[PDB]
Amino acid sequence: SMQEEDTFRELRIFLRNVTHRLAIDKRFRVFTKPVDPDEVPDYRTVIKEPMDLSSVISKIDLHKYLTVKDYLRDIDLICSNALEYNPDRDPGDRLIRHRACALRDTAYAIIKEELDEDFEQLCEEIQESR
Ligand SMILES: CN1[C@H]2C[C@H]3CN(C=O)C[C@]31C(=O)c1c[nH]cc12
C-alpha cells in the first residue's frame, strides 16, 4: 500500500540521520570509507565481508534495509570486522578496538532513545507479509 511505502520512507530518513551523526564524530573517521586495497592488500584476504559508513548510506538509498534490525546487523559487522582484524595488545590495535566498541554502543544508544518500538514492530510485520 501507499501507507506501507510511507512507513519505509520514514525508516530511511531516520537511518540517514543516525548514520550522519556517527560519520561526523572524529572517533569514527577510520570507519567512514572502505579500506584501501593498496595500503592494506592483506585486508580482503582476512575480512570476508568488508563494511563501512559510506557503504551503509549507499545501502539505505538502494532500499536494502526494511527494519532497524537489518541496519544494526551492518553496524555490528563494522565493529566485529575491526575486532577480528586488530586483535593484538599493542596500542594501535587497542585504540581501534575501543573506537569500534564506541561506534556500536553509540548507535544502539541513539536507537534506544529515538526509535519508537511500535514503529520498528510495524516495519517487521510489513517485511514478514512480503
Ligand atoms: C532494534 N531493535 C528493536 C528491538 C531491539 C532488539 N535488538 C536486537 O539487537 C535491538 C532493538 C532496539 O534497540 C530497539 C529500540 N526500539 C525498538 C528496538
**Ligand 1 site, CB within 6 A:** 68-69, 72, 108, 111-112, 115, 117, 120
CA separation for the pair 59, 78 (Å, rounded): 14
User: What is the number of alpha carbons within 13 Å of residue 112 lying toward its C-beta?
Assistant: 6
Nearest CA to ligand 1 atom 8: 69
CA separation for the pair 67, 76 (Å, rounded): 15
Instruction: Please state how this structure was obtained.
Output: X-ray
Residue numbers after which the chain is interrupted (C to N above 2.5 A) read none
Residue 42 Cα to ligand 1 midpoint, Å, equals 35
Grid coordinates representing 105 are 554502543
Residues in the chain, how many?
A: 130
| Measured CA distances, 60 to 35, 103, 108, 114, 129 (Å) | 20, 18, 18, 18, 21
* Ligand 1 atom having least distance to the Cα of 120: 17
Nearest CA to ligand 1 atom 14: 112
Nearest CA to ligand 1 atom 7: 69
CA separation for the pair 12, 14 (Å, rounded): 5
Alpha helices by DSSP H, 1-130: 2-23, 43-46, 53-61, 68-85, 91-114, 117-128
The secondary structure of residue 114, as a DSSP letter, is H
- List b or e across 98-118, with b for residues whose CB sees 16 or more CB atoms inside 10 angstroms: ebbeebbebbeeebeeebeee
Q: Domain tally for the chain?
A: 1
Nearest CA to ligand 1 atom 16: 117
Residue 112 Cα to ligand 1 midpoint, Å, equals 7
CB 32 within 8 A of CB 23: yes
CA separation for the pair 82, 104 (Å, rounded): 11
CB 23 within 8 A of CB 53: yes
CA separation for the pair 97, 100 (Å, rounded): 5
| 44: helix, strand or coil | helix
* Region at 115 (left for phi over 0; alpha for psi -120 to 50; beta for the rest): beta
Per the structure, the complete domain to which residue 27 belongs is given by 1-130
Burial tier of 127 (Cβ tally within 10 Å: 0-12, 13-18, 19+): middle
Grid coordinates representing 87 are 586483535
CATH number at residue 74: 1.20.920.10
